[PDB]
């Protein structure tokens, strides 16, 4: 509103619009829908009746995140401005305290700021007195349910008044929410509309990608060979291999059916080809191009593959010495949770059960003193507080709090087999 | 008498051969004279009055006579 005038600055020194820059502009998550096409009507025809008849209803939709329920209801009200209402985005998680939404409503009727106590008095005074038109979105309803349900009873008791000019639209995480958190007295007021949103399917996940790729798929750019700048000296084209787009769809529809996850894995795979193109020619920052299948093979795996295995083999020696002692106790006792003094008891013992091998002796010299035969005879090993602190904040280990530094228990936090498996290297 | 013949329809509503709470009129006749109890089937009005008593017991209904909801 105000400060967007101050967020503008002047000197914009000719940023290089490369080949893959114009992809990510439309691969931004902003800018009729194919997948939830008919269900848009099922909201709207439920909404169009109450709007043009001055009533008060409730609409309940559910589903996993990434299915358009943030998007679709915005498209409902957007066309309605063409044809009497006040649009508010009452987000649940964007309220700091749960009562703070009450302030917004009384602010968004006349422009006044009181407490949440004094708002809902005049709100109740509004909802049963006004002679005769308010659209409200109660987003992310896991936030506003938590304390004692006294807030949630209000937001549907206002719907019961026949003289209440309000239209509520609830969007939740799960259909189960008025059956495993709310009471039945709320569950009578929620109704039984219950419009379910499923996931997306992999065919439609192809049909959502090309909507972003409408005017740019297999099109042509005008490029100077000196700076790498592209314009919608050569006239190059850039093509997108649809089969790699398909294998993006057949995974994301399989695991999650999430519309952000489908776009972003294409967005991550787009910039892999960006740096490899910049690697071969180096246009910096100041014949026919494509995106291979091998890009989305890596980037989809890049969502999965870890490093704690690679982290463990790149740790210190006494770190790998520590875990090897720790699995030795877990196969000695079978109790998966060993006392800290017994580990210090073991790393002493794991010295001399091995032979007089000078590597172990050059270890055993260093393991109790950093050379320096002057100062010696250390009880616990060198930096034993350090590696145990280093294994703690790494999340691999976990150690309960006790002022005794002997009988405080230690519990593993990652799978102990992969700890056994990474130890083998 | 009446408990046994409706009890067949219970496990035959446990299967999806009626596909819904809707069920056709020919679905009845292939579930009385086709199934096990012989000669207990009453007159053309009487077990048709017998299914009224089940409707009077509010467990199954009769509607859109080629089908019944």
């Amino acid at each position: 509103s105000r400060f967007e005038n101050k967020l503008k600055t002047t000197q914009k020194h000719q940023i290089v619009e490369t080949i893959f820059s114009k992809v990510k502009k439309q691969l931004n998550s902003s800018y009729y829908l194919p997948a939830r096409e008919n269900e848009f009507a099922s909201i709207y025809l439920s909404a169009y009746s109450a709007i043009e008849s001055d009533s008060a209803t409730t609409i309940y939709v559910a589903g996993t995140p990434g299915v358009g329920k943030t998007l679709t209801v915005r498209e409902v009200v957007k066309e309605l401005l063409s044809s009497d209402f006040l649009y508010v985005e009452i987000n649940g998680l964007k309220m700091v305290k749960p009562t703070d939404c009450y302030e917004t409503l009384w602010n968004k009727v006349s422009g006044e700021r009181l407490t949440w106590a004094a708002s809902m008095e005049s709100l109740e005074f509004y909802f049963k007195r006004v002679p005769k038109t308010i659209v409200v979105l109660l987003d992310e309803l896991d936030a506003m349910v938590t304390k004692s349900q006294d807030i949630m009873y209000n937001f549907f008791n206002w719907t019961t008044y026949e003289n209440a000019k309000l239209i509520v639209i609830a969007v939740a995480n799960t259909m189960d929410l008025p059956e495993r958190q709310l009471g039945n007295k709320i569950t009578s007021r929620i109704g039984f509309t219950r419009i379910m949103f499923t996931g997306y399917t992999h065919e439609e996940l192809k049909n959502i990608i090309d909507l972003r790729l409408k005017g740019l798929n297999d099109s042509f750019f005008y490029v100077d060979t000196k700076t790498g700048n592209a314009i919608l000296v050569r006239k190059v084209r850039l093509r997108m291999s649809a089969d790699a787009i398909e294998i993006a769809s057949r995974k994301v529809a399989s695991v999650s059916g999430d519309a952000r996850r489908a776009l972003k894995v294409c967005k991550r795979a787009a910039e892999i080809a960006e740096k490899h193109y910049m690697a071969k020619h180096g246009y910096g920052y100041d014949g026919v191009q494509t995106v291979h299948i091998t890009h989305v093979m890596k980037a989809l795996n890049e969502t999965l593959n870890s490093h704690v295995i690679t982290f463990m083999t790149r740790l210190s020696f006494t770190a790998k010495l520590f875990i090897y002692a720790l699995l030795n106790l877990m196969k000695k006792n079978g109790s998966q949770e060993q006392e800290l003094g017994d580990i210090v008891d073991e790393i002493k013992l794991l010295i001399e059960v091995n032979g007089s091998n000078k590597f172990v002796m050059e270890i055993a010299k260093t393991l109790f003193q950093q050379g320096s035969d002057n100062i010696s005879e250390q009880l616990r090993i060198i930096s034993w507080d350090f590696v145990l602190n280093q294994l703690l904040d790494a999340g691999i280990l976990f150690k309960q709090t006790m002022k005794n530094d002997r009988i405080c228990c230690v519990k593993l936090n990652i799978s102990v087999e992969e700890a056994k498996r990474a130890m083998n290297e | 008498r009446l408990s046994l013949i409706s009890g067949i329809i219970a496990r035959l509503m446990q299967t999806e051969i009626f596909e819904e709470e809707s069920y056709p009129v020919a679905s009845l006749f292939e579930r009385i004279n086709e199934e096990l109890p012989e000669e207990e089937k009453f007159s053309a009005q009487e077990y048709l009055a017998g299914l009224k008593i089940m409707s009077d017991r509010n467990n199954l209904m009769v509607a859109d006579d080629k089908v019944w909801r």
């Binding site: 039945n184 | 219970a10 496990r11 446990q14 089940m54 467990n59």
Partner: protein, 326 residues
């Protein structure tokens, strides 16, 4: 361990209990009760005379004393002392100790307003200043003309809130003042565990027996036993759908076909098929949803076959059979 238990008792409903209880407590031993009440009436001039000496009078004894204190404080003493000093009579401030909602702040806020606000004592109101504010009350009262202006009554001094220790010491400093007479009663058998020689120095208690074997009508109200669930879910079934009665009837039959424990219970699959047999349960979800309503009001249990069993006794379920289900 074959023990006879209170569950195996012929139980009594709400209106049946309290009415026949009211018959006994007003007609059992009526003649000797007022016959006691006339005997102890001659002690009333003796209490009046000792109470001029600022003695904290304490009444022990079996039975409730609540009726006796209110006759002795209100009607007898409080106008007798006003007539003997020479106009409204002496203000009586009772303290219902059997009422657990007594605090130290609220009753003392009454006290300083019952007592004289001759100075700005709200200036010393500041953060616990209660002992501070009463100390400024005490030393001023050491140099005043000796006359009672207030008599307070504390019923059931071993009560659930008055027996708290920060409240007890509060009353201790009140009793050393000569202007107020402290007539209280306790009922506990371990009531003299409450006071040391520090407090009784401030108290100078004396004792008298009153045993009229009263029923304690008001003092029974806050108290509860298992008379006051088998009786809890006895009322919810009286207001539900008509189908829930039938699906509980089919529940209660085969759960009492075999105390009502786990072993007499039924598996979920066959019970779904059984309540599918009488054209009642459509499937598992329609069964379970109107079975969660029996779960939400804790009217049935489940342990592991997948055994759902009713936690009421063998005798209770046939009572639930012939009365409310039928």
């Amino acid at each position: 361990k074959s023990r006879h238990t209170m569950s195996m008792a012929p139980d009594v409903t709400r209106e049946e209990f309290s009415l026949v209880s009211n018959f006994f407590n007003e007609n059992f031993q009526k003649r000797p009760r007022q016959k006691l009440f006339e005997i102890q009436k001659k002690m009333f001039p003796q209490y009046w005379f000792e109470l001029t000496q600022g003695f904290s009078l304490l009444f022990y004894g079996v039975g409730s004393k609540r009726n006796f204190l209110e006759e002795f404080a209100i009607d007898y003493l409080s106008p007798k002392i006003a007539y003997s000093q020479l106009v409204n009579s002496i203000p009586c401030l009772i303290l219902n100790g059997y009422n657990p909602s007594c605090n130290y702040r609220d009753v003392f806020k009454e006290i300083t307003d019952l007592l004289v606000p001759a100075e700005l004592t709200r200036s010393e109101t500041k953060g616990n200043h209660v002992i501070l504010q009463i100390q400024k009350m005490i030393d001023f009262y050491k140099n005043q003309p000796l006359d009672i202006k207030l008599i307070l009554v504390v019923h059931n001094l071993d009560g659930p809130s008055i027996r708290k220790n920060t409240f007890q010491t509060m009353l201790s400093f009140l009793s050393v003042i000569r202007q107020i007479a402290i007539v209280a009663s306790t009922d506990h058998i371990y009531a003299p565990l409450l006071w040391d020689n520090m407090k009784a120095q401030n108290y100078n208690f004396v004792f008298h027996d009153i045993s009229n074997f009263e029923p304690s009508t008001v003092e029974s109200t806050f108290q509860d036993v298992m008379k006051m669930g088998a009786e809890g879910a006895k009322y919810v079934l009286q207001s539900l759908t008509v189908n829930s009665k039938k699906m509980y009837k089919l529940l209660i039959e085969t759960q009492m076909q075999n105390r009502g424990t786990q072993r007499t219970g039924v598996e979920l699959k066959l019970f779904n098929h059984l309540c599918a047999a009488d054209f009642i349960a459509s499937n598992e979800i329609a069964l379970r949803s109107m079975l969660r309503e029996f779960i939400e009001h804790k009217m049935a249990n489940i342990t592991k076959m997948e055994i759902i069993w009713v936690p009421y006794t063998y005798a209770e379920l046939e009572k639930l059979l012939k009365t409310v289900l039928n």
